[PDB]
Amino acid sequence: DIIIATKNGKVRGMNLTVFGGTVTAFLGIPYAQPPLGRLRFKKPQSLTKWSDIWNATKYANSCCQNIDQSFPGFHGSEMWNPNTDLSEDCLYLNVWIPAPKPKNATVLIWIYGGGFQTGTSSLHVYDGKFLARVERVIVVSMNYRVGALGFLALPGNPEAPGNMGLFDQQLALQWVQKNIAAFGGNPKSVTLFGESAGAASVSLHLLSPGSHSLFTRAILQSGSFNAPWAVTSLYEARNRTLNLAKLTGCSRENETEIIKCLRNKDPQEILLNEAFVVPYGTPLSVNFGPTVDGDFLTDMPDILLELGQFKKTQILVGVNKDEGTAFLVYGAPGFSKDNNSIITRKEFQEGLKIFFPGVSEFGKESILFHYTDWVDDQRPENYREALGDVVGDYNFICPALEFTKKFSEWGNNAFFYYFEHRSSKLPWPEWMGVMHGYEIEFVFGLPLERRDNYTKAEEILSRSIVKRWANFAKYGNPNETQNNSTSWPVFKSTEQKYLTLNTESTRIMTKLRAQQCRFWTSFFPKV
Amino acid sequence: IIIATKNGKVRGMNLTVFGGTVTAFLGIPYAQPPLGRLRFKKPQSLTKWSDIWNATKYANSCCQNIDQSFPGFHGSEMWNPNTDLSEDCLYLNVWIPAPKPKNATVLIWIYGGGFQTGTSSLHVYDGKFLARVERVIVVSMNYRVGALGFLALPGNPEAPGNMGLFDQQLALQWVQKNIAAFGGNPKSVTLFGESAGAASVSLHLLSPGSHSLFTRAILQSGSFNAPWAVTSLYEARNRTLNLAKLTGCSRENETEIIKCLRNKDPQEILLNEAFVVPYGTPLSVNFGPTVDGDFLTDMPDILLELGQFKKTQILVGVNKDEGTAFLVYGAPGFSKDNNSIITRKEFQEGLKIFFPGVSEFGKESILFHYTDWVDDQRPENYREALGDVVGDYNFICPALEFTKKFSEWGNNAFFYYFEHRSSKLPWPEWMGVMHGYEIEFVFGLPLERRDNYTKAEEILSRSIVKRWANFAKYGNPNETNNSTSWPVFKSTEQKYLTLNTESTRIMTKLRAQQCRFWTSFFPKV
Ligand SMILES: *[C@@H]1O[C@H](CO[C@H]2O[C@@H](C)[C@@H](O)[C@@H](O)[C@@H]2O)[C@@H](O[C@@H]2O[C@H](CO)[C@@H](O)[C@H](O)[C@H]2NC(C)=O)[C@H](O)[C@H]1NC(C)=O
Ligand SMILES: *[C@H]1O[C@H](CO[C@H]2O[C@@H](C)[C@@H](O)[C@@H](O)[C@@H]2O)[C@@H](O[C@@H]2O[C@H](CO)[C@@H](O)[C@H](O)[C@H]2NC(C)=O)[C@H](O)[C@H]1NC(C)=O
Ligand SMILES: *[C@@H]1O[C@H](CO)[C@@H](O[C@@H]2O[C@H](CO)[C@@H](O)[C@H](O)[C@H]2NC(C)=O)[C@H](O)[C@H]1NC(C)=O
Ligand SMILES: *[C@@H]1O[C@H](CO)[C@@H](O[C@H]2O[C@H](CO)[C@@H](O)[C@H](O)[C@H]2NC(C)=O)[C@H](O)[C@H]1NC(C)=O
Ligand SMILES: O=S(=O)(NC[C@@H]1CCCN(Cc2ccccc2)C1)c1ccc2ccccc2c1
Ligand SMILES: O=S(=O)(NC[C@@H]1CCCN(Cc2ccccc2)C1)c1ccc2ccccc2c1
Ligand SMILES: *[C@@H]1O[C@H](COC2O[C@@H](C)[C@@H](O)[C@@H](O)[C@@H]2O)[C@@H](O)[C@H](O)[C@H]1NC(C)=O
Ligand SMILES: *[C@@H]1O[C@H](CO[C@@H]2O[C@@H](C)[C@@H](O)[C@@H](O)[C@@H]2O)[C@@H](O)[C@H](O)[C@H]1NC(C)=O
Ligand SMILES: *[C@@H]1O[C@H](CO)[C@@H](O)[C@H](O)[C@H]1NC(C)=O
Ligand SMILES: *[C@@H]1O[C@H](CO)[C@@H](O)[C@H](O)[C@H]1NC(C)=O
Ligand SMILES: *[C@@H]1O[C@H](CO)[C@@H](O)[C@H](O)[C@H]1NC(C)=O
Ligand SMILES: *[C@@H]1O[C@H](CO)[C@@H](O)[C@H](O)[C@H]1NC(C)=O
Ligand SMILES: *[C@@H]1O[C@H](CO)[C@@H](O)[C@H](O)[C@H]1NC(C)=O
Ligand SMILES: *[C@@H]1O[C@H](CO)[C@@H](O)[C@H](O)[C@H]1NC(C)=O
Ligand SMILES: *[C@H]1O[C@H](CO)[C@@H](O)[C@H](O)[C@H]1NC(C)=O
Ligand SMILES: *[C@H]1O[C@H](CO)[C@@H](O)[C@H](O)[C@H]1NC(C)=O
Ligand SMILES: *[C@H]1O[C@H](CO)[C@@H](O)[C@H](O)[C@H]1NC(C)=O
Ligand SMILES: [Cl-]
Ligand SMILES: [Cl-]
């Protein structure tokens, strides 16, 4: 029988057969009191103690969230939708342990993305059994509250203070500290990693003093807090709180009556109004996300970064080749996943209106001018690819590069990567390229499974990335082997070297998309 | 089998070597691990252990950056560490003839690696052949490299400089207090080393605290007066502060700088070592020996001219093509994968990379002196000139100058010029007889006939092996009847012995016309 004694009680797991070995899995451990009833919109309350044995043998409920139904039946969009029932009672975590039990294993803690409005740790692409099996690491992941239930903010009011989903994540890290030894893991060797809004969350744990003792190192995939979508100003968030009140007939004279009113709405009545709190949004709108709450964040994060007030540790950062393409088929004119989306100069100008709704006509012209110095005038694909790059540079690449620059300037080793391989099984069309989110399956080792019809090159790439990630967690250095391997050098703000990841050649290069990023850092803010 | 050292018992291993047996002790600890509060400090003497230490595997190599310019390539990876890296690395190895001798001369090897890399467990430093064929006891030790071994704030015991030099000194101390228990003679000990190991050896000649720890010295392709060998206290101060800024460790206080640096991950020290110098070259020594006021009481060249050093017999030499290895770590037009033919303009660009602070006039004068072609048709003329510039300035001419001055104090000195290119050499033919590729002949590797060496290579390696062990035992590098006698190097005739498979001649005034530039004109540009 598979039983571990946690400080809240005993849990029962399951045995999994992975590559002729075993992985012990405990799926669905609770780490907090369910945020029901009067605990709606409050920080997670710590768990008590049960006397039974909790049966951690299935994934648990996913937190309440709207679903993406833009392409019914499409594996492309549906692989991100929740694969367990939805409920407000969702504060559960999973643990994958290598067999035979380790004695001081390094722990990798995954934090999913989803614009802070969607996501769940139970998705097939976040399956930590391969990492446990192949690299002997413990893998942990948690469900955290998304949308208004996760990030509604009346700043300074404990009834709805903001950043609750981030405190959710933080509590799960507290659990790993208190309990992971009992499973064989070293609480002094804990590496957070996440993707997109999960990576933005990981960068915010670097800034937040209450997290500093809960992990060792950070891995940020396709996101950072200084991305234009990741943080809301303190008073833009309280404004959206009040318009959600109005949208459900909860406008009141004092804030705590507002909250008491919101607490008796049914989740669906809240999720049904979340889109409407922003006047005019883009496909990258975060309706309810991290804010300056005075608690988890004591200042706008760009200030803390500049002043050097953050955890001093090693980081691993990178981005994908085609971050922007996914968002074009969610609101730009002339774009479909089912045709090759050749657009015109004026469709391109309408695209920019979709993604830059508040920008002047001169600013939209300067973006267009910077992105139309074609190598070949036709190339019908010019304007289609230009728009993908505008979205991808402004929203993911240039901020990740800026964060790594500023962070490395205070003396810790930083490593940067450019992921360039398109998955051979990728359900989206070819013109969308190396999309946002489609390195995750390679980070978790899914191509190591041969019955799954990936290419042998893809198994070798995924085997490499798994090794480099797990070595970075263990040693602070994303090396593969000492010989017959390209050295991944540290990213310093002068040379700015990064490693490229694909099947043909891993190369050291420098100054990734510097001529694009110079626009967003040095011209666009002045517009 | 087991031996009792003054601090506990160690257990060894049997090696079967050329029909006989060699008894090996690999990975004996000789100092406390320089960890935690001991990082950057001198080595702390060890205290007795009650168990039995098992010196049966090579130990951890000291933290160091790894040459990964050529992933897969044997010619560079054979210098990379072949045990795990760790700050816990002050171990040494001992190889003993079988059956046990009772008063064997000891040969102590100090490896090179520009003071930044290296380890005693490399295959080309395997001491079992020397013990088997000549009945000498061979020792080698790991010492700290890079900033972890040579970070200097002069006068502060928390980071004084030369810590890696004192590592070597503590290992020499262990041999004085323990080699007799193994069957060795502490009164017959010869240091030998290559490149930075050779420079290390020559500094042990100058440092009075090492005076009593050895008898004689062998210096392969290096000496302390080489331009890359010693950092000024000025340079060391600029580089320690630069490492502080690069790690986030700038403080207003020296001791706060070091308390911050003791908290850094070793990789955060290693991976910043490269940026502490603005104008680096492929021969840059980021953190090397300094005048610390302890190991070195004064500037080495002063101690040399005044005669303030251990008086004894020394054996010194260089290889024919010392410079070529460095040409593929920076110079333009050079590759291990093509014949590296270059033009006069590319030659001028190589000079820029090797001499970044030299005036345009001085770089012109380097050019002129090295372009008096015997045959001005050969397209490889400039390729050869540049390797000869680097080799003469950095290794050959400093070694000749060192041997001249050392000899003028009544000491018997012997100089050699090694010209054999190994038949197995992984690097292209144009690099010739490279830096570091006499070592495998000195350690007896070609004596193993299941190894793709040539017959001539076995015979050449057997005489070098014999001559070296003879210099250790008797103070004179003699050999067998049919064997050229090796005459003493003296300032006026300047005789040296040539080493190759064809014929070993006696010649005079090695490369005198090249070196006249580096001693008598270059110092004035
Ligand atoms: C003594 O150190 C200073 C500081 O130098 C920089 O070197 C960088 C590569 C990097 O490692 C960084 O940590 C450090 O700041 C040297 O100063 C510089 O000199 C060059 C001229 O060659 C100028 O171009 C730089 O602007 C200047 N930088 C600063 C900050 O002053 C200086 O050269 C060095 N001197 C010696 C003799 O080593
Ligand atoms: C061991 O290593 C090479 C691969 O080294 C390439 O591996 C990359 C991950 C990267 O680190 C890079 O620096 C390194 O050079 C092995 O090579 C490859 O071998 C497979 C078959 O096993 C071929 O299908 C590939 O085309 C080939 N890629 C190359 C050569 O770039 C190789 O087997 C081995 N090399 C040696 C010298 O032992
Ligand atoms: C990757 O590089 C790291 C260096 O950062 C290697 O780390 C040492 O690893 C061993 C385990 O084999 C430890 O016992 C040492 O203490 C580590 N030392 C340091 C300074 O980190 C690691 O072994 C390398 N891994 C591979 C597969 O090459
Ligand atoms: C697991 O590994 C840790 C180190 O990461 C061990 O902790 C030791 O080192 C700590 C450094 O942070 C110090 O607190 C102590 O020297 C030591 N901690 C102790 C003895 O509790 C930890 O012991 C390991 N646990 C094992 C091997 O079971
Ligand atoms: O809460 S979200 O609305 N999630 C819904 C998304 C809409 C964008 C496409 N997909 C995800 C996706 C991923 C890959 C490939 C196909 C589809 C569904 C949201 C909102 C802002 C973000 C801002 C940044 C990143 C993610 C964000 C997610
Ligand atoms: O240890 S190093 O830091 N590494 C750079 C070297 C460049 C020389 C080629 N190799 C080693 C090598 C050896 C032989 C033949 C092929 C290759 C790697 C270093 C740094 C300064 C030096 C200065 C002087 C001498 C040696 C030095 C070594
Ligand atoms: C805050 O937001 C206000 C938005 O008002 C709106 O009405 C609500 C109900 C929603 O449906 C939104 O779509 C509407 O835009 C702004 O009117 C106000 O100026 C903002 N700022 C401040 C400082 O109040
Ligand atoms: C959890 O399940 C318990 C039953 O264990 C069951 O019996 C054991 C031996 C295994 O076979 C297991 O797979 C079976 O499901 C119940 O007795 C217990 O009440 C359950 N606990 C809770 C909290 O529901
Ligand atoms: C779990 O796996 C272990 C080790 O592989 C095995 O000994 C045991 O029988 C399994 N227990 C189950 C399936 O309950
Ligand atoms: C040393 O190795 C021997 C090999 O025979 C082993 O028996 C012994 O347990 C080891 N002792 C140690 C590590 O103290
Ligand atoms: C060798 O060892 C003996 C051991 O008694 C010692 O007396 C002698 O001085 C040593 N020296 C030499 C040069 O052999
Ligand atoms: C160095 O500065 C620290 C800062 O408080 C101080 O405690 C220490 O005594 C200082 N030491 C010297 C020698 O100035
Ligand atoms: C040798 O190779 C290097 C790098 O590949 C190149 O720059 C150089 O021009 C080549 N030289 C010749 C003669 O082919
Ligand atoms: C000698 O060469 C052969 C192939 O040519 C190789 O297999 C063998 O291992 C080599 N010898 C040694 C000692 O490596
Ligand atoms: C493809 O996408 C939509 C299909 O509804 C359409 O508006 C767009 O113009 C189409 N483009 C083509 C077919 O090139
Ligand atoms: C070396 O090893 C054995 C094993 O202990 C030792 O007794 C003997 O002196 C040597 N001889 C052989 C054949 O190993
Ligand atoms: C060389 O070794 C010693 C030292 O001079 C001497 O006794 C011996 O006879 C010499 N042998 C030859 C062959 O020169
Ligand atoms: Cl996502
Ligand atoms: Cl060397």
Author numbering:
A (entry chain A): 3 to 529
B (entry chain B): 4 to 483, 485 to 529
Give verbatim excerpts from the published study on this entry.
Cholinergic neurotransmission in the brain is terminated by the hydrolysis of ACh, which is catalyzed by two cholinesterases (ChEs): acetylcholinesterase (AChE) and butyrylcholinesterase (BChE). The assumed co-regulatory function of BChE in termination of cholinergic neurotransmission in the healthy brain changes in brains of patients with progressive AD. In specific brain regions of these patients enzymatic activity of BChE is increased. Altogether, these data suggest that BChE is a potential therapeutic target for restoring ACh levels in the brain and thus improving cognitive impairment, while also minimizing adverse effects in patients with progressive AD.
The crystallographic structures of huBChE in complex with compounds 2 [-(CH2)2-OMe], 7 (-H), and 8 (-Me) were solved. These compounds differ only in terms of the presence and nature of their N-alkyl group, and hence share a similar binding modes for huBChE. Specifically, the positively charged nitrogen of their piperidine moiety engages in cation-π interaction with the Tyr332 side chain, while the attached benzyl ring fits into a groove contributed by Tyr82, Tyr332, Trp430, and Tyr440 side chains, in the choline-binding pocket. The naphthalene moiety is T-stacked (i.e., π-π interaction) to Trp231 in the acyl-binding pocket, while one of the sulfonamide oxygens forms a H-bond to the hydroxyl oxygen of Thr120. The type IV inhibitors revealed that variations in the N-alkyl substituent on the sulfonamide nitrogen were permitted for maintained inhibitory potency against huBChE, although its removal was not. As observed already in the complex structure of huBChE with compound 128, no conformational change is undergone by the enzyme upon binding of compounds 2, 7, and 8. This observation suggests that the active site of huBChE is fairly rigid upon binding and that tailor-made compounds are required to achieve potent huBChE inhibition. As both the R and S enantiomers of these sulfonamide inhibitors provided a fit to the electron density maps, all of the inhibitors were assigned to the R-enantiomers, on the basis of a possible cation-π interaction between the positively charged nitrogen of the piperidine moiety and the side chain of Tyr332, which is not possible for S-enantiomers.
